[PDB]
Design a protein around this ligand. Structure first.
Ligand code: ADP
Lengths: 62, 290, 284
């Protein structure tokens, strides 16, 4: 077999139709924000995966 | 490393050296002290490690300038423009596209834009793995309220939202460029040329179509859509004419990659599994490239 | 995260970081004790004054350097917040200043001139876009004092010019609380969390916590101020990663952040006249 990307898949979950964020959900109601390709799930997928980067320890430092 | 030989590059911004297997890139420091496009190109290429984006062995300081390292062999642009039709649509069109999209996805999952994609930016290696480099106008994907720049990518490889003037865009502008790399690779011609002007918008409308209100919405919010009139989008009679050297599944992800819709543009996580590499034949990295 | 520049060469432990402090205080003792024995051309008269300034400078600033750089970090924080900057570039300026003074001491490079260069490299780092003269007219700089300590700051920084900061974990765990929990959400958590945990992580970046743990761990440490029902009910129901090890990591990070002591107005006297200028008094 083959893999398209060799190791590029995280196993966490997401659900973008739940949140009530007052900085992006109100920001996407404007005209020029939509026109550059912006939607809510791309920003949430950008920030939530960054919120889980690096859950390690200080034992893994030597 | 402290090794030098003969120089490449007649540009006044930077003249790259060579030596050892590596290539020393020097930014002339001698307004501001250090330019934006020196720290802007070291600060994201330092932190990426991949077999499709080149890396830094050492970034040792010069007396006045900044030294980097690079790769030895030439680029994808000299491959396309001067050959005797070595490149064949069974296997040579698939492996390089797969590796460039692997590099683009590694840039994307680090949330780094890399808005300078050209065949003279994509460079090969002695084992033939194509690399993604020259992060000169790259940027991290910022907060959504932050205003970005405009003219960030070159003319022949420009996303149509950047033609229209999108000030604060997403990272889907660099899938359009590698789709034009796909078409430039399977057509062996400079795809979508412009006459050093705003004529890139008219030739993009003539090639792939003036976007309509029903389909890519909010395109009239740029103060540029009212300047011109509508053009017909191409139908599937393009399968034989002007694209006869192609497969059945190549046009599917080509048309999904040359969507002028940026929200519905196929991201690399759904371009690496777009059932085009699953079709026979399997690719292989030994290719007859000098 | 292991491929990032913050993990592979500037993330430390307590023994490694204390070793880093004692080697930058051990490699920066001989040159400074050699450069402050310079007496007059014929003979030295005030022996007792030059030896009590030697006793004030040489064996005393090995621990005065840490609260000195914390005081000047507070100074660069308040002057970066004074000139209307976002919280992202203030955090990078604090980190660039502190990462500069981990590899160099405060005597062979004076800290009163680094504090204007770090805001410049931070705003030119993540595209703030201030110019040089517009930055100079908004500051106390005359275009030369922001650019001479620039090459050596990047040399001592060794070009780790992108930093990961806990504000994107704030915007992530602003949303992942609401996804997994629905009982008591988003009334107090938008009332008094976004205006408090932000200032607590600015106070954390003033302290020494970002060389210890990952910014989501610092985020979940500073979210434990309200640990009545938020953090314990978050990490119990989330569960590849065990929970109790992460609770112990967050708890020892809270034990790190609670050993706090603010600055004073005494450290100023030792460096104000004893170094490079008091001698002039001795001479005349
Ligand atoms: N690793 C390399 N090996 C051989 N030549 C290189 C290499 N890197 C760059 N070059 C040359 O350096 C020049 C790129 O400089 P630059 O103008 O800044 O790129 P761009 O046009 O994308 O902005 C090109 O001429 C290229 O041939």
């Amino acid at each position: 077999p083959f893999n398209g990307d060799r190791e590029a898949h995280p196993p966490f979950t997401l659900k973008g139709s739940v949140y009530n964020d007052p900085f992006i959900k109100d920001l996407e109601h404007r005209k020029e924000f939509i026109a550059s390709g912006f939607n809510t799930n791309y920003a949430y997928e950008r920030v939530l995966t960054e919120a889980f980067m690096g859950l390690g320890c200080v034992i893994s430092e030597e | 490393e402290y090794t030098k030989e003969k120089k490449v590059g007649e540009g006044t911004y930077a003249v790259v050296y060579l030596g050892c297997k590596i290539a020393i890139k020097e930014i002339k420091t001698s307004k501001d002290g250090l330019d934006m496009s020196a720290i802007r190109e070291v600060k994201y290429l330092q932190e990426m490690q991949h077999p499709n984006v080149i890396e830094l062995i050492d970034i040792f300081m010069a007396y006045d300038n900044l030294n980097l390292v690079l790769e030895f062999l030439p680029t994808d642009l000299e491959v396309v423009i001067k050959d005797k039709s070595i490149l064949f649509t069974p296997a040579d069109i698939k492996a390089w596209m797969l590796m460039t999209l692997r590099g683009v996805y590694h840039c994307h999952r680090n949330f780094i834009l890399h808005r300078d994609l050209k065949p003279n930016n994509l460079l090969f290696s002695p084992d033939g793995q194509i690399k993604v480099a020259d992060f000169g106008l790259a940027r991290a994907i910022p907060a959504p309220h932050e205003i970005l720049t405009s003219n960030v990518v070159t003319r022949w490889y420009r996303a149509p939202e950047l033609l229209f003037g999108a000030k604060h865009y997403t990272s889907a502008i660099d899938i359009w460029s590698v789709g034009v790399i796909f078409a430039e690779l399977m057509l062996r011609i400079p795809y979508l040329p412009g006459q050093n002007d705003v004529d890139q918008m008219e030739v993009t409308f003539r090639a792939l179509g003036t976007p309509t209100d029903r389909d890519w919405p909010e395109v009239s919010s740029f103060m540029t859509y009212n300047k011109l009139q509508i053009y017909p989008p191409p139908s599937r009679d393009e399968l034989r004419k002007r694209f006869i050297a192609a497969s059945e599944y190549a046009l599917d992800f080509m048309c999904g990659m040359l969507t002028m819709n940026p929200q519905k543009r196929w991201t690399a996580v759904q371009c690496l599994e777009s059932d085009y590499f699953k079709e026979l034949p399997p690719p292989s990295d030994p290719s007859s490239i000098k | 995260y292991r491929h990032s520049s913050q993990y592979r060469m500037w993330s430390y432990t307590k023994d490694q970081l204390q070793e880093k402090r004692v080697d930058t205080n051990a490699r920066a003792i001989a040159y400074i004790e050699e450069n402050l024995l310079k007496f007059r051309e014929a003979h030295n008269l005030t022996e007792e004054e030059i030896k009590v300034l030697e006793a004030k400078a040489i064996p005393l600033t090995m621990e005065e350097e840490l609260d000195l750089v914390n005081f000047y970090a507070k100074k660069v924080q308040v002057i970066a917040q004074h000139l209307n900057l976002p919280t992202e570039v203030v955090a990078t300026a604090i980190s660039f200043f502190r990462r500069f003074f981990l590899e160099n001491s405060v005597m062979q490079i004076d800290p009163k001139s680094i504090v204007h260069t770090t805001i410049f490299l931070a705003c030119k780092s993540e595209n703030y876009f201030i110019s040089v003269d517009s930055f100079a007219q908004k500051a106390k700089s005359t275009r030369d004092s922001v650019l001479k300590f620039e090459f050596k700051l990047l040399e001592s920084l060794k070009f780790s010019l992108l930093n990961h900061h806990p504000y994107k974990p704030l915007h992530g765990f602003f949303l992942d609380i609401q996804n997994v929990l629905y009982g008591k959400v988003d009334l107090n958590y938008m009332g008094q969390i976004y205006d408090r945990c932000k200032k607590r992580i600015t106070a954390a970046l003033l302290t020494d916590v970002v060389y210890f743990y990952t910014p989501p761990q610092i985020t979940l440490a500073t979210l434990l101020i309200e640990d009545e029902a938020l953090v314990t009910r978050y990490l119990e129901t989330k569960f590849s990663i065990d929970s109790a090890k992460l609770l112990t990591i967050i708890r020892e990070c809270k034990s790190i952040i609670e050993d706090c002591k603010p600055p004073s107005t005494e450290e100023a006297k030792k460096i104000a006249a004893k170094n490079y200028y008091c001698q002039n008094p001795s001479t005349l």
